[PDB]
Design a protein around this ligand. Structure first.
Ligand code: HEC
Ligand code: HEC
Ligand SMILES: [Ca+2]
Ligand SMILES: [Ca+2]
Ligand SMILES: [Cl-]
Ligand SMILES: [Mg+2]
Ligand SMILES: [Xe]
Ligand SMILES: [Xe]
Lengths: 352, 251
């Protein structure tokens, strides 16, 4: 297999992503450098097979029944439909540039694919019966990184990661309507790698970084150049946008990427790729902080470097490059996919 | 007498303007004078010469030890909530004729205090918790059910909410909604009376300019002043010494 963006060969799978069946019996790992998807039995924790897909998959999504796996092939500019039981790819549908993510609707009738190409703004919809692209939903700006569907199933958010932009936003889509109702801008943000929903659907979490672009590059202290942040947005109309720090004063979480939401919404799990660790936060303390604070106070608290310790549950050692994380349906276990170490770290959560 | 006590000067709304923090004690039949309120008459300064009305209310009768009135149990207020006067309790009392005034508050058994579980919490459940949940701070719901904090379950949700500290404020002064031994400085009391009571503002923005709701008509005078008394007493949780039947820490 090839290292991304290069013609150089490697024998290493290099997992870029991970997910889990709704019945929690199977883990599906997208191998970026392996151009395939590894199947892992959750119970025995060993590999049950490797399914060949198109070239450089960065993402995957499982149908509610768990009979199919929809994989996002980034360089092939496509999406592979794989039979889970047969361990074989039964189709290839082709989409806009660089899908970085795909999600299946609650009814399982539809799959939404975020096209992350720098000059490309699209969310391509795919009927599961036709097993083909239906239409395309144009976002407010370029390069959607990932989407997420509400538990309601009537709303779809897309994080827009836009090159050459300090203010990076999130689009709200009405699934029945199929276009943009509202666009909410995260100010002074960059590199949004994920978006997740709270079980009650009243909030969304987005991992990103806050650069200071307008300042000289001088020291590394007190996040003079980059700080790392998680933002909670209230799905309510006119809701708050709360930018919160992931960092200590002398300890930062480099490049937060993947997110896993606790089934009951008690904890938030954040893959930290740069510092190779999983940051676990208490969501009732976070949301408690959001509800009890004004917008001004939150905006001031974004730069508080001692704030994290209030809502921070843990930081757990992981393999190198944990770009993605996922949870078991009972929420008692958290899996983190490590690219460089070519493995998966299994974590026992606080849930008992 | 022979018991530790201190005192608080009160305004026309019955709230403490200044609290004397110390422990004073009187011997039997003894009495004590002071020129002022921490004026320095008992510390660094000579007694100021003062002709006071209280001097004539002290002992005027030859057949009595003291003609001065005993401490009253309650207060009476007018329709606006102003101080109307002082009110007798049910502790009234061998006994001999050695004082002119009715004997009140000498029974240690029946001495009244304000307990959060017995007094305040039911008021909170009745008049408050309906609109106040996790989504609308402070959270007054949950009843008397204990909330575990850092592996310790002591008080309820409402108590934990009301006693919560505020950023940039000395906890020795107060928290977000509560200033111990000052009701007049407490944001909660500020909102319950819907006015600025003191010269010390609890925080920068107090009364919302949008979506504000008047809280002054939610409580009767007895309930509101019960909260005032609770805060002025130091805003405790368990005010009944020793283990009792009311909800609390158990292992
Ligand atoms: C529904 C009719 C309510 C009842 C019953 C109670 N409160 Fe309330 N409260 C309500 C709203 C809509 C708001 C928003 C802000 C505002 O000023 O209107 C509040 C707010 C408070 C506050 C201020 C919180 C803060 O500024 O940080 C306090 C201190 C408060 N509420 C206390 C309180 C008490 C003691 C109640 C029982 C008498 C009570 N509330 C009832 C709505 C409603
Ligand atoms: C207004 C309230 C009063 C009144 C009517 C009296 N005192 Fe005094 N007192 C007062 C304050 C604010 C303080 C200090 C509180 C603190 O430091 O936090 C005190 C203190 C005392 C003390 C302790 C020693 C000292 O601080 O000087 C003693 C003893 C004392 N007060 C005695 C006292 C006497 C004899 C009074 C006459 C009735 C008296 N107090 C009245 C405030 C107030
Ligand atoms: Ca492409
Ligand atoms: Ca007790
Ligand atoms: Cl004095
Ligand atoms: Mg330096
Ligand atoms: Xe760690
Ligand atoms: Xe005193």
């Amino acid at each position: 297999g090839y290292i991304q963006g290069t013609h150089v060969k490697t024998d290493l799978p290099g997992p870029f992503h991970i997910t889990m069946s709704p019945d929690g019996s199977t883990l599906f790992i997208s191998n970026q450098s392996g151009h395939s998807v590894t199947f892992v039995d959750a119970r025995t924790q060993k590999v049950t097979g490797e399914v060949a897909v198109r070239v450089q998959p960065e993402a995957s999504a499982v149908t509610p029944d768990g009979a199919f796996l929809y994989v996002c092939n980034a360089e092939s500019d496509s999406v592979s439909v794989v039979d889970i039981q047969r361990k074989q790819e039964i189709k290839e549908i082709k989409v806009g540039d660089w899908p970085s993510g795909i999600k299946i609707s609650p009814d399982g009738k539809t799959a939404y694919v975020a096209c992350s190409g720098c000059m490309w703004n699209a969310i391509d919809v795919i009927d599961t019966g036709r097993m083909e692209k239906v239409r395309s939903i144009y976002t407010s700006d370029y390069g959607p990184r990932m989407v997420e569907i509400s538990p309601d199933g009537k709303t779809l958010v897309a994080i827009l990661d836009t090159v050459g932009s300090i203010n990076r936003s999130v689009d709200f889509i009405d699934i029945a309507s199929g276009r943009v109702v509202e666009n909410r801008v995260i100010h002074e943000s960059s590199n949004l790698r994920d978006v997740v929903y709270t079980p009650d659907g009243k909030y969304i979490a987005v991992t990103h970084q806050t650069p200071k672009n307008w300042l000289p590059v001088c020291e590394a202290e007190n996040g003079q150049v980059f700080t790392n942040n998680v933002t909670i947005i209230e799905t309510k109309a006119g809701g708050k946008v709360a930018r919160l720090p992931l960092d200590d004063l002398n300890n930062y979480d480099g490049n937060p990427y993947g997110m896993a939401m606790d089934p009951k919404g008690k904890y938030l799990y954040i893959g930290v790729r740069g510092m190779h660790r999983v940051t676990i936060l208490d969501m009732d303390k976070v949301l408690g902080l959001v509800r009890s604070s004004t917008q001004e106070e939150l905006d001031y608290l974004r730069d508080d470097l001692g704030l994290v310790r209030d809502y921070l549950v843990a930081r757990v050692p992981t393999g190198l490059g944990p770009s993605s994380v996922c949870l078991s349906p009972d929420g008692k276990f958290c899996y983190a996919a490590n690219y460089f170490s070519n493995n998966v770290t299994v974590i026992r959560t606080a849930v008992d | 007498s022979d018991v530790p006590y201190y005192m608080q000067i009160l305004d026309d709304k019955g709230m403490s303007v200044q609290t004397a923090l110390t422990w004073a004690y009187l011997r039997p039949y003894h009495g004590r004078i002071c020129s002022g309120c921490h004026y320095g008459s008992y510390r660094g300064r000579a007694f100021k010469n003062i002709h006071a009305k209280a001097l004539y209310n002290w002992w005027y009768d030859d057949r009595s030890h003291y003609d001065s009135p005993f401490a009253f149990r309650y207060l009476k207020f007018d329709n606006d909530g102003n101080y109307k006067g002082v009110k007798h309790g049910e502790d009234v009392v061998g006994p001999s004729g050695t004082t002119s005034q009715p004997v009140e508050g000498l029974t240690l058994d029946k001495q009244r205090t304000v307990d959060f579980r017995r007094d305040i919490q039911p008021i909170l459940d009745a008049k408050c918790a309906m609109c106040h949940d996790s989504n609308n701070p402070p959270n007054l719901g949950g009843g008397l059910e204990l909330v575990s904090v850092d592996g310790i379950a002591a008080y309820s949700r409402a108590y934990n909410s009301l006693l919560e500290p505020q950023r940039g404020k000395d906890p020795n002064i107060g928290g977000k909604y509560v200033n111990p031994s000052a009701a007049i400085n407490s944001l909660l009391v500020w909102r319950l009376y819907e006015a600025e009571l003191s010269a010390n503002a609890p925080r920068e923005k107090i009364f919302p300019i949008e979506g504000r709701l008047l809280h002054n008509k939610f409580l009767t005078q007895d309930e509101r002043y019960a909260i005032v008394e609770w805060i002025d007493l130091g805003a405790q949780w368990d005010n009944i010494p020793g283990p009792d039947f009311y909800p609390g820490y158990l292992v």
